[PDB]
């Protein structure tokens, strides 16, 4: 379960995501393994994620996304991505 929501302004505010590090990626496709839990706020872009077990999600600008520890998936970056991210 990749969890995805359009966060309220308050939730976003209280997480102080603008202090989180920034990661960017050009159009590309690659496997990823989540060593830790990870929450990402998408500033720009569009990505199709397919998990090891075949589940499919799209994440795009304005989404708050949480990836669980131990998830193996493949990212397909369709529009260049910019995000704030917090490992936990």
Closest alpha carbon to 42 in 87, 73, 79, 1: 79
| C-alpha to C-alpha distance for 83 and 42, rounded to whole angstroms | 4
Residue-number span of the structural domain to which 45 is assigned = 1-88
CATH of the domain at 15: 2.60.120.10
Rounded (5°) CA angle 76-81-86: 100
Q: What's the reported resolution, in angstroms, to a tenth? A: 1.8
Q: How far apart are CA 36 and CA 54, in angstroms?
A: 21
Task: State which approach was used to obtain the coordinates.
Answer: X-ray
> How many domains does the chain divide into?
1
DSSP secondary structure letter of residue 17: G
Q: Rounded distance, CA 52 to CA 76, Å?
A: 14
Helix (H, G, I), strand (E, B) or coil at 54: coil
């Amino acid at each position: 379960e990749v969890k995805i929501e359009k966060p309220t302004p308050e939730k976003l505010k209280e997480l102080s995501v603008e202090k989180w590090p920034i990661w960017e990626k050009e159009v590309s496709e690659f496997d990823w393994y989540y060593d830790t839990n990870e929450t990402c706020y998408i500033l720009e872009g569009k990505v199709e994620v397919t998990t090891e077990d075949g589940k499919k999600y799209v994440i795009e600008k304005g989404d708050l996304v949480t990836f669980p520890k131990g998830l193996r998936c493949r990212w397909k970056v369709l529009e260049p991505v910019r995000k704030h991210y917090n490992l936990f």
